[PDB]
Amino acid sequence: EDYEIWKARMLAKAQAK
Amino acid sequence: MDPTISVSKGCFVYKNGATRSLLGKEVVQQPFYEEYRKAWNQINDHIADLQHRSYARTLEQLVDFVVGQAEREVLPTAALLTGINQPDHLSQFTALTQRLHAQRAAMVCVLQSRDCATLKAAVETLVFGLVEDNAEVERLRRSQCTMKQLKSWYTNNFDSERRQLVVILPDFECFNASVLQDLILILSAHCGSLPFVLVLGVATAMTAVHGTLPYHVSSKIRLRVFQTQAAPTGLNEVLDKVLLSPKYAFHLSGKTFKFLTHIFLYYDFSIHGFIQGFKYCLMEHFFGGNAFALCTDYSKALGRIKQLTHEDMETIRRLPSFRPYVEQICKRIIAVLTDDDYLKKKLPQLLRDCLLHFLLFRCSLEFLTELVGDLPRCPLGKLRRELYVNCLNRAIISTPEYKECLQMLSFLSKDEFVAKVNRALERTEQFLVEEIAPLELGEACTAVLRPKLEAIRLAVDEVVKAGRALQKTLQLIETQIVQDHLRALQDAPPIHELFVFSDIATVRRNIIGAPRAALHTALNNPHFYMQCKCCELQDQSLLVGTLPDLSVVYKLHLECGRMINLFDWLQAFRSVVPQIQARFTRAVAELQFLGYIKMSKRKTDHATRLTW
Amino acid sequence: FVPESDGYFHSAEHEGSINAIMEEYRSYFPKWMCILNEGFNILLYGLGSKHQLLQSFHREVLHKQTVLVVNGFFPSLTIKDMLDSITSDILDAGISPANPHEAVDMIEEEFALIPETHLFLIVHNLDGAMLRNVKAQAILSRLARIPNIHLLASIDHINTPLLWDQGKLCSFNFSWWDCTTMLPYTNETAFENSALSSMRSVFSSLTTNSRGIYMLIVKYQLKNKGMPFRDLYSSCREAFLVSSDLALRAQLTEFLDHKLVKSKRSVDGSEQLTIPIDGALLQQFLEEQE
Amino acid sequence: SLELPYYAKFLLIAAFLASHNAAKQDKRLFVKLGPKSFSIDRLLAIFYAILEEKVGLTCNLLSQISTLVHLNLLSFVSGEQNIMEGSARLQCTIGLEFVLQIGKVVGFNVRQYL
Amino acid sequence: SQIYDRDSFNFEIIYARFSKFAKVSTTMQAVERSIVLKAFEHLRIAELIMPLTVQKEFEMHKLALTYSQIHHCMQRYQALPTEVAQWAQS
DNA sequence: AAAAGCAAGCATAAAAGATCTAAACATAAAATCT
DNA sequence: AGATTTTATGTTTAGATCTTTTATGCTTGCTTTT
């Protein structure tokens, strides 16, 4: 997993929480 | 062509004001260069101090031998059974010259094998070294430095006072035999008139000294044998006292540790090559940015956190251990992944966590290594370095060898078991008092570790004052020392990547040199390097027609026998793909230039392969 | 690369790809400057020619530092030439002493006298045609030991580290770098280290009597499928092609100079005169002379 | 009492087998007067035959060959001027008992191949 | 030299021929190979043995003596043990 | 019958042995500084 | 009118050369065991 798409998906999981 | 490519000259000066710190000020004023230079100066000075403290006993014995000859025909002479690692011993002989000059007991010449191809050159460099060494303590041409001039110079100077004339011969094995025997007979002829002492540097054994010195030459020899310590003992001393010291914030990973010791034990016993490889590891670690300049002692680390910019924040976010730290945590992770200042305020807790974990790792290792390596068969090894590599490379409790250690420690009688655990407790407490108390962040480390040691000592008192309690003592030792303070490197606290160095591939590439592997994978599959869209081979023996021209000739070469006629080789290459004959001649000339083939001399238009 | 011993006991798109490879190796350069600053020396061990890469390093990065380029692929360079070049041009110290290790001792003293006067030393093909002896590698290792002198070097031969023992390999504080360009070995093989038409071209320049002497050797070779010297001497004195023996020896010395004739002496003392060309082409040459 | 690196020990016992076993017996021992001359490629072939581990041909291994030559553990009976061209001939110059001691420390039983 | 008709010898051949006597000599059992090697070098530096002009233990050599000189040494020698005097005859 | 083994043969080459020559070293003529 | 590099010159020794001679080795041509 690339760092950029992982950081973006984790920010999406935070903002969707 | 290029102006550098000349038919006449071979060397091309580009002088820019040379008469009779390469980097600019941007790099030297960067913090990562400062922390790298600081850690390297500390590590290099500690290793030099260890080497001097190991050599000092043999140094005092050699200086006492020279002064004892000075208190007083055969020339006195001192064989020094030094190790295979010849370059390292020049510092030893230099320390011997420093001691002999500081006592004013002797003057020293050093006879390298490169300077003494003949007896004339040996006598000239010997007399020139003695006279210029005396001149350097407080220039004749080398054509006129006769031994008679050495006698006249010694009578003009030191006859009124006796300085010894020590003649170090550091590379005894490299000498011509006849020149060395004639030189020993010459120095033996001048004994009484000139006080000579002949220390030697025998890398092999005394049988070489008894072999190269004949009956006539050994009739005039009164040699005494000194022994330098073994190279693996010096490696173990450096690895335990320097690379495993608590006080350095930079640690190698277990793979890099095993790789550098593998180069030492399996290839060359030079300490200097191991030191340069550790220096390359330190440089490859610290040149990744100012985020790796955080890897230092705790106060300068807090100053580095308050110095930081934004690319350093990005490269402390990108490192792999941060991702479990984020997913094991919403507004806090928005402030961590975006706000930057919150990560600047939260860095000191993570840095103190990592430094405290590595201090507890070293203390729990200083506990466990005695208790494990005293055992017969040693499942985890004797010294601290093997248990360091084992506990870092993988989780220790899940290994079969830890089960073997628990079984063989369970089989002990009560007296040796209680004596072993008490020896581990006394050794760990002595280490906590001696080495962790002066260190910064060592008070908190002692505060974490010491009640656990008191609980293990209470379990020892419980098994003393009362069979099955030994299993409870093993459980206390496992879950307060091995489980908590000896985690695998993947289970280290987050942003431990700033402190360990685990990138073994690029450093193994840049230290271990394998030209033949690069030439092999370049002459077999060019697609590995060129990355063409057409030149890929599904297997390495295919020989496709779109290959670069050296590869086709190399494969038609590889697929046959030793002696190779050029003509059917040319027909096969012409069948694969005028200018084609010139391309074949260019490929055969390049393949000869690499040494893979050679032209035959006895048989025209043929070639023999030098490879097998 | 883990070779098996049984082989001894039984004995377009390419331009863009090469340009991307060269741009990556050009991107490596600041790391090489820091590595050279730390005391390591650079060694390149790729497949193709690395002349243009080290020339680009000298051109783009070392544009103002003192630099001694050394062409190791030169057939006729000597280590005395390189030590004389350093001693005379870098330090203005005159000619180096005739013992090369004395010259390295002198260079070490004079470079100890001048800190922050670094001398870069670029050696294309450290395994060069005249650097393959152990002594020149010992001189190069003693020069690379100096803190002032930094060294970049290329390696091409497969058997190069057979001459580096651990002392030289410790003096050569190498940082190995796989710079595998795919460029052809033009300049490295352009030098001297790596026929009926020529016979006609030299036969045209000869005089009539030399043509008769060579035609006599050609007729004897085609008739007998090397002639003794006495038969050629009697045939030339019968055909009036020579005045005495010594002029015939001068003509055969000219033929040996122009390689038309090989002279193979016999155990009996007679001189044999082989023509080193196959008899079909020799028969065609005799038909050309008619 | 001559401490050695591990691969230097295998190189030294391989040079002893190359100088002690003659050229013809390698085909029967490894496919699976005085000391004999041996070329360096014969030494590498016997070393890879007795190694049973197959390390790569790095710079350090041929450097171990040259530094065994420099310690007078091996010798240059000929060649010298052309070590790289394959015309060089080496000659092992140690006794059998040191080879048996090295084979005790290593665990390679030398006497099977003699 | 008498057996092989003045062929060149070697330290190994001469040490083997000496040890075949030394195993039954009952006075020469105690010598080391190194003492015999230093004795061979002591013979070489007196030019009683000359090189044919390779390890020092394997270099080929020539005797520099007629057999009559060694035979007169056998009679002129002082305190010669009888075992050596019997071995010299055969 | 397959592949290791002994005389044969020219050939690079290696010693050598004289021999000639180029560069390093000792030395004298001389402008130069005092 | 005297000291100092400076330069031009001669000698000497190490290296290039010519030549003979000798040898191991590269290849050949049978030769012979498995």
Residue numbers in the entry:
A (entry chain F): 223 to 239
B (entry chain C): 1 to 20, 38 to 89, 94 to 159, 177 to 199, 202 to 369, 372 to 508, 562 to 672, 687 to 721
C (entry chain B): 276 to 286, 323 to 505, 515 to 545, 552 to 616
D (entry chain E): 318 to 349, 375 to 456
E (entry chain D): 358 to 410, 420 to 456
Can you provide the manuscript's text about this entry?
The loading of ring-shaped, replicative helicases onto DNA constitutes a key event during the initiation of chromosomal DNA replication. In Orc1–5, the AAA+ modules are augmented by a C-terminal HTH domain of the winged-helix (WH) type and co-assemble into a pentameric ring that can exist in both open (active) or closed (autoinhibited) configurations. Structural studies have revealed that the initiator binds DNA in the center of the ORC ring, bending DNA to prepare origins for Mcm2–7 recruitment and loading. To resolve these outstanding questions, we determined cryo-EM structures of DNA-bound Drosophila ORC (DmORC) assemblies in the presence and absence of the co-loader Cdc6.
In the DNA-bound initiator·co-loader complex, DmORC and DmCdc6 form a two-tiered hexameric ring, with each layer comprising the Orc1–5/Cdc6 AAA+ ATPase and WH domains, respectively. In the Drosophila complex, both tiers are planar and oriented perpendicular to the DNA axis within ORC’s central channel. The co-loader Cdc6 is phylogenetically most closely related to ORC’s Orc1 subunit15 and adopts a similar 3D structure as Orc1 in the ternary initiator·co-loader complex. In DmORC·DNA·Cdc6, the co-loader occupies the position between Orc1 and Orc2 and engages in canonical and non-canonical AAA+/AAA+ interactions with Orc1 and Orc2, respectively, to close the ORC ring. The N-terminus of Orc3, part of which folds into a β-strand that abuts the central β-sheet of the Orc2 AAA+ core, is sandwiched in between the Orc2 and Cdc6 AAA+ domains, sealing the ATPase ring and forming a tripartite interface. Two conserved Cdc6 arginines positioned in a helix that typically harbors the arginine finger in AAA+ ATPases—a residue involved in stimulating ATP hydrolysis of the adjacent protomer—contribute to the interaction network, indicating that this region in Cdc6 has been co-opted to mediate protein-protein interactions at the non-catalytic Orc2/Cdc6 site.
